[PDB]
């Protein structure tokens, strides 16, 4: 602390950040692949059907939460 | 009258005190087989956390929700595969698997 | 003299009305990915995987789609949710769609003195490190609320169009650099 | 309203507990009466009004460059830090008053004055007892080093203050 000025100057010559960021951040903020594929207006009804709950699953959920 | 039922505590320094901001949650982490059976439960039910918490007695519904959000943010392909695959709801075999997981965690604690 | 850095939108929030009443009980019963608990919350949570969005559908037809990355992706997600509601057996429509909020993130790649920033723009900023490590700036021009971190990362919110966030970042970049 | 005066008398009582001057008392009552005008704060929770008392006292303390941590306030305010910070952000966004930053030197001095390593007490032997002025100057130099080396920015200041005073206490007599 007697001559900490020049010492800190040289220390910054050779920025304090959290340890989780100084682990060689090679790929900083990787660019995500832009995906604006919208189709015409939708895709299909197969996904609608795969989202809809089957009667078997409905009855099973009712039995479980009875 | 309190017949030496409690012990005086020499706390609360009148000088000053600081803050904590973190009190209760203190969750418990998962494991590989537990993540596997959790993905199985997802594929078997969906996203309704009520049924998932009902079928998981030993893990909290809030922890299950946090895990699902973490998986949605990190591993999307796995969630997609889980939703692609489907399994009819099994109750007795699921209770048997719950007993198996209880035995496994007991063995872990023994280790 | 542009800044040379472009923010990345991470969440797009938009409200849209269906124009008809809905039965949340049947909506949650006839769906697999449906999450709803009337005693806990009066909104059904719908989740699809194209833009990985989340829709908060209510009984009055109002649904808020969040988590998208672009306005077109948010519109596509809202239309897919509307189609799902229609297939559930309701006369749902796609009316009154408008971007409500968009959250973005960016990095400047150099440290920032939060104390100096707040001393220079106190009337436009607020810094309380004992509560949140990030300085909260209220952008002068649009309703941009910015969280600036010491590491050089800035999160922007409170806009309606991508151009607003872009010009806000372009205006705030020289202030942080200086 | 009785809730107003009540909460207000609570502000005054907290001022008397912290032994703050009547000027601070007046500033606190003035800021409380100013904040009571808003309806969102007027018709609020009881915890909301209590944290309003706390935040008004904190703003009054900050307006005169006086050091006072928020934990010490929350300790005697019967509240939790989460709701405290939430309502503090809400009220500052609703009012827009000047919020001077907490100076590091004043906090260092106030926290070092609490330590008992100045007068030889029965528990602490004489070896641990050190000089007050030199140790405070060393702690000030160390916390200035920490503020110029990007150690206090983004982190809680009091842990750094404690580390600095501990390093000073050890350097004054390493053996």
UniProtKB/Swiss-Prot annotation, chain A:
Phenotype upon changing residue 20 to D: Impairs formation of a ternary complex with DNA and TBP
Description of what induces expression: Down-regulated by epigallocatechin gallate (EGCG) treatment.
Residues modified as Cysteine sulfenic acid (-SOH): 20
Region (Required for interaction with TBP and formation of a ternary complex with DNA and TBP): 24-66
Region (Required for the formation of a ternary complex with DNA and TBP): 16-22
Consequence of substituting residue 20 to A: Abolishes response to oxidative stress. Abolishes the decrease in the formation of a ternary complex with DNA and TBP in response to oxidative stress
Changes after translation: In response to oxidative stress, Cys-20 is reversibly oxidized to cysteine sulfenic acid. Oxidation of Cys-20 impairs formation of a ternary complex with TBP and DNA and down-regulates expression of target genes in response to oxidative stress.
Compartment list: Nucleus
Quaternary structure, from the entry: Component of TFIIIB complexes. The TFIIIB complex has two activities, alpha and beta. The TFIIIB-alpha activity complex is composed of TBP, BDP1, and a complex containing both BRF2 and at least four stably associated proteins; this complex inhibits the transcription by pol III via its phosphorylation by CK2; YY1 facilitates the TFIIIB-alpha complex formation. Interacts with TBP; this interaction promotes recruitment of BRF2 to TATA box-containing promoters.
Family indicated by similarity: Belongs to the TFIIB family.
Protein name (Swiss-Prot/TrEMBL): Transcription factor IIIB 50 kDa subunit
Biological classification of the source: Eukaryota, Metazoa, Chordata, Craniata, Vertebrata
Gene: BRF2
Residues of the full protein shown: 301 to 407 of 419
UniProtKB/Swiss-Prot annotation, chain B:
Disease: Deafness, autosomal recessive, 112: A form of non-syndromic, sensorineural deafness characterized by postlingual progressive hearing impairment. Sensorineural deafness results from damage to the neural receptors of the inner ear, the nerve pathways to the brain, or the area of the brain that receives sound information.
Tissue specificity of this protein: Isoform 2 is highly expressed in cerebellum.
Organism whose genome encodes this protein: Homo sapiens
Top-level taxon in the UniProt lineage: Eukaryota
Role summary: General activator of RNA polymerase III transcription. Requires for transcription from all three types of polymerase III promoters. Requires for transcription of genes with internal promoter elements and with promoter elements upstream of the initiation site.
Protein name: Transcription factor TFIIIB component B'' homolog
Subcellular locations according to the entry: Nucleus
Annotated ranges, domain Myb-like: 22-72
Curated annotation (Swiss-Prot), chain C:
Superkingdom classification of source: Eukaryota
Alphabetical keyword list: Disease variant, DNA-binding, Host-virus interaction, Neurodegeneration, Nucleus, Repeat, Spinocerebellar ataxia, Transcription, Transcription regulation
One annotated Gene Ontology cellular component of this protein: nucleus
Annotated compartments: Nucleus
Main location as per UniProt: nucleus
Amino-acid positions noted as binding DNA in the UniProt annotation, renumbered to this chain: 11, 47, 62, 101, 138
Keyword Acyltransferase recorded: no
UniProt-listed GO biological process terms: DNA-templated transcription initiation; mRNA transcription by RNA polymerase II; positive regulation of transcription initiation by RNA polymerase II; RNA polymerase II preinitiation complex assembly; spermatogenesis; transcription by RNA polymerase II; transcription by RNA polymerase III; transcription initiation at RNA polymerase II promoter
Tissues with expression: Widely expressed, with levels highest in the testis and ovary.
Record function comment: The TFIID basal transcription factor complex plays a major role in the initiation of RNA polymerase II (Pol II)-dependent transcription. TFIID recognizes and binds promoters with or without a TATA box via its subunit TBP, a TATA-box-binding protein, and promotes assembly of the pre-initiation complex (PIC). The TFIID complex consists of TBP and TBP-associated factors (TAFs), including TAF1, TAF2, TAF3, TAF4, TAF5, TAF6, TAF7, TAF8, TAF9, TAF10, TAF11, TAF12 and TAF13. The TFIID complex structure can be divided into 3 modules TFIID-A, TFIID-B, and TFIID-C.
Protein name: TATA-box-binding protein
Species of origin: Homo sapiens (Human)
UniProtKB/Swiss-Prot annotation, chain D:
Sequence repeat ranges per the UniProt record: 7-92, 108-175
Protein's cellular compartments: Nucleus
Effect ascribed to mutating residue 45 to A: Decreases affinity for DNA
Residue numbers spanned by region Interaction with target DNA: 43-49
Induction: Down-regulated by epigallocatechin gallate (EGCG) treatment.
Family to which the UniProt record says this protein belongs: Belongs to the TFIIB family.
Subunit structure as annotated in this protein's UniProt entry: Component of TFIIIB complexes. The TFIIIB complex has two activities, alpha and beta. The TFIIIB-alpha activity complex is composed of TBP, BDP1, and a complex containing both BRF2 and at least four stably associated proteins; this complex inhibits the transcription by pol III via its phosphorylation by CK2; YY1 facilitates the TFIIIB-alpha complex formation. Interacts with TBP; this interaction promotes recruitment of BRF2 to TATA box-containing promoters.
Stated role: General activator of RNA polymerase III transcription. Factor exclusively required for RNA polymerase III transcription of genes with promoter elements upstream of the initiation sites. Contributes to the regulation of gene expression; functions as activator in the absence of oxidative stress. Down-regulates expression of target genes in response to oxidative stress. Overexpression protects cells against apoptosis in response to oxidative stress.
Protein name: Transcription factor IIIB 50 kDa subunit
Source organism per UniProt: Homo sapiens (Human)
Gene (name only): BRF2
């Amino acid at each position: 602390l007697q001559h900490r000025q020049s010492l800190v100057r040289s220390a910054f010559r050779d920025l304090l950040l959290p340890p989780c960021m100084l682990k060689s951040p090679k790929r900083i903020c990787p660019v995500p692949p832009v995906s604006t594929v919208t189709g015409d207006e939708n895709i299909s009804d197969s996904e609608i059907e795969q989202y809809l709950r089957t009667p078997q699953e409905v009855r099973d959920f009712q039995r479980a939460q009875a | 009258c309190v017949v030496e039922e409690n012990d005086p505590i020499f706390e609360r320094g009148s000088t000053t005190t600081y803050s904590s901001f973190r009190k209760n949650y203190y969750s418990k982490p998962w494991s590989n087989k537990e993540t596997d059976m959790f993905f199985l439960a997802i594929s078997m039910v969906g996203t309704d956390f009520s049924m998932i918490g009902q079928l998981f007695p030993h893990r909290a519904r809030i922890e299950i929700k946090n895990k699902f959000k973490r998986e949605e943010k990190t591993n999307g392909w796995r969630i997609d595969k889980a939703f692609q695959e489907k399994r009819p709801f099994d109750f007795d075999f699921f209770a048997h698997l719950l007993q198996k997981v209880l035995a496994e965690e007991e063995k872990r604690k023994q280790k | 003299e542009s800044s040379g850095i472009v923010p990345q939108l991470q969440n797009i929030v938009s409200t849209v009305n269906l124009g008809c009443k809905l039965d949340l009980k049947t909506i949650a019963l006839r769906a697999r990915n449906a999450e709803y608990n009337p005693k806990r919350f009066a909104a059904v949570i719908m989740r699809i995987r194209e833009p990985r969005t989340t829709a908060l559908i209510f009984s009055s037809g109002k649904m808020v789609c969040t988590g998208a990355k672009s306005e077109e992706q948010s519109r596509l997600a809202a239309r897919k949710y509307a189609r799902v509601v229609q297939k559930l057996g309701f006369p749902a429509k796609f009316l009154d769609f408008k971007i409500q909020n968009m959250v973005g993130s960016c990095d400047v790649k150099f440290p920032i003195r939060l104390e100096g920033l707040v001393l220079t723009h106190q009337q436009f900023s607020s810094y309380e490190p004992e509560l949140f490590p990030g300085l909260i700036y209220r952008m002068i021009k649009p309703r941009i609320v910015l969280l600036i971190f010491v590491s050089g990362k800035v999160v922007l919110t409170g806009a309606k169009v991508r151009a607003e966030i872009y010009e806000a970042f372009e205006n705030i970049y020289p202030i942080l650099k200086g | 309203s009785r809730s107003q005066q009540r909460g207000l008398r609570r502000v005054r009582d907290l001022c008397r507990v912290l032994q703050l001057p009547p000027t601070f008392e007046d500033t606190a009552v003035a800021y409380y009466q100013q904040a009571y005008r808003h309806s969102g704060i007027r018709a609020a929770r009881l915890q909301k009004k209590e944290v309003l008392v706390g935040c008004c006292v904190l703003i009054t303390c900050r307006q005169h460059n006086w050091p006072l941590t928020m934990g010490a306030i929350c300790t005697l305010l019967y509240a939790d830090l989460d709701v405290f910070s939430s309502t503090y952000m809400q009220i500052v966004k609703l009012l827009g008053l000047d919020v001077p930053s907490l100076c590091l030197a004043e906090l260092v001095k106030t926290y070092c004055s609490s330590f008992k390593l100045f007068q030889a007490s029965p528990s602490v032997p004489a070896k641990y007892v050190e000089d007050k002025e030199k140790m405070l100057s060393r702690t000030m130099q160390l916390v200035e080093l920490a503020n110029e080396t990007w150690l206090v920015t983004g982190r809680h200041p009091l842990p750094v203050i404690t580390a600095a005073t501990f390093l000073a206490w050890q350097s004054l007599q390493p053996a």
